[PDB]
Amino acid sequence: KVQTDPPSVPICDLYPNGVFPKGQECEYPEEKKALDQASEEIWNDFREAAEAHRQVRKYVMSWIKPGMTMIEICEKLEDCSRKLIKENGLNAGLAFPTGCSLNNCAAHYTPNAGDTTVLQYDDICKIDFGTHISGRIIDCAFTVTFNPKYDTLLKAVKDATNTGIKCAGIDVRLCDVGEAIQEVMESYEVEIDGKTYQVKPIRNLNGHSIGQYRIHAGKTVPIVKGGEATRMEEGEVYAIETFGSTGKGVVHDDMECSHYMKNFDVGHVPIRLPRTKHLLNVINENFGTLAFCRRWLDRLGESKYLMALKNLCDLGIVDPYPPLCDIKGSYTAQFEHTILLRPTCKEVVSRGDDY
Ligand SMILES: *C[C@@]1(O)CCC(=O)[C@@H](OC)[C@]1(O)[C@@]1(C)O[C@@H]1CC=C(C)C
Ligand SMILES: [Co+2]
Ligand SMILES: [Co+2]
CATH class of the missing domain: 1.10.10.10 (Winged helix-like DNA-binding domain superfamily/Winged helix DNA-binding domain)
Known part of the structure; x- marks a missing residue:
């Protein structure tokens, strides 16, 4: 139908013909149109997953507030994700656990049973959650804050992520993407509680290619200079994510x-x-x-x-x-999208009106 107030209608029931919305399509920085169209069922599955991700995250941004426990946040997010992806065993579902890493922690925290952690007004929380249809995985992530003191740190990382997204392309060297991200991220200086910092990319965290049922398909996208000159290739799919820090x-x-x-x-x-x-x-x-x-x-x-x-x-x-x-005491932020390197164009499949 139309989506409900608190989302409850599966994405597949919103698009009865089974054709899902494209994300943002970009020119890269004949036969190929036939090549693109031959994999249309795959692109379409990524798009279905991306629309679930867009609707889930919009909902999350409406209610996530200090005072909730991290367990409450993750279960309320995952509930919605399972409903909108129309969870079905390994054919449709959650691609990986809901990251909600706090403060100096940048990635790979979600609470286990018994965790009493409560989200605070001064927390900076990275929400990183994934959906998939038939193993076509969206990895997309944003940072939640409630104190405006982090606003420039968030802007730095968002701009660095969008720069990595714009630099990406068929035949682009992965090292060149990392150098570009670092140059933009380090052009930002921020002031938090009277101390000033130049934003630094977290050098041992990376974006990554994505394969079927494979969150990390083996090629890594650096977020600092100095990486490999391995090229991106037509047909590949990448999670372009960056992480900035006030710490080491x-x-x-x-x-x-x-x-x-x-x-x-x-x-x-x-x-x-x-x-x-x-x-x-x-x-x-x-x-x-x-x-x-x-x-x-x-x-x-x-x-x-x-x-x-x-x-x-x-x-x-x-x-x-x-x-x-x-x-300890440092602040980290993350933004991320999944991109498809289609034969005819680069699609930022998880792009939304939010980020
Ligand atoms: C979880 C992760 O995405 C964080 C950022 C990375 O550096 C990235 O590796 C390139 C990851 O470490 C990732 C994809 O390798 C892990 C595998 C994923 C999960 C969710 C455990
Ligand atoms: Co992610
Ligand atoms: Co990722």
Whole structure:
């Protein structure tokens, strides 16, 4: 129909012909039109996922407020995402857990069960959540703040992300994208509680190509100079994300781990330990090679699984992705879109009227 006040209509029911809205189409910085059209079912699946992401995030921006717990925020977001993507096993669903990393933490925090963290007025929270249709994944992310003191830090990172998006293209060197992002990001100076800083890109965080059911398909997009001159290629899909910091501009692993994901290259492994076998079966049926978090095991009724999960990590079947944080007292921000390198044009598929 039309979407409801608090969104509840699946995107696929809003577009009855099954043709979903294009994102922003850009010229790059005959046969190729036939090539583009031959993969139209794929582009269309990304667009369906991107429209779910646009409607979910608009809803989130309407209610996210200090005083909510991080668990309340993530469950209310994920509820809406499951409804609008019309969750259906591995055919449609959430691509990876809801990041809501706070303050000096830049990526890969979501709360586990029991976490009592409450969002504060002075917090800077990176909302990074993903949707997919048939494994075509949108990774798109924005920063939430309530104090206007962070406004220039947010503007720096947004401008750096849009610069990486504009520089991207077929035959562009990945190192050139990183150099461009850094030059824009470092042109910003900010003042927060009487201290001034030049914004720095977080050098050991990266954008990344995306493959089917594969959030990180192996090519990395640097956000500082000095990276690889490997080129982007026609048909590739990238998460162009940047992270800026008032700290060292370097993240380390910190806090409890919540995010896990099966190693894409690992195939069948016979396991006889009962609890570890069961948990591997649960992961294979519900997530495949998509990332998941502990809250998502809890909701499937799993319990007593932490030792099984460690076993799978120690076997190398699953990998842990702990929160990634700069130094204590620093502030980090993130903006991100997914882009499609179509034969005829570059589509910023997750672009919205918001960012
Ligand atoms: C989670 C992540 O996107 C943060 C930013 C990165 O640097 C990026 O790696 C290029 C990530 O680390 C990513 C894609 O590798 C992880 C895999 C994804 C999940 C959600 C655990
Ligand atoms: Co992301
Ligand atoms: Co990403």
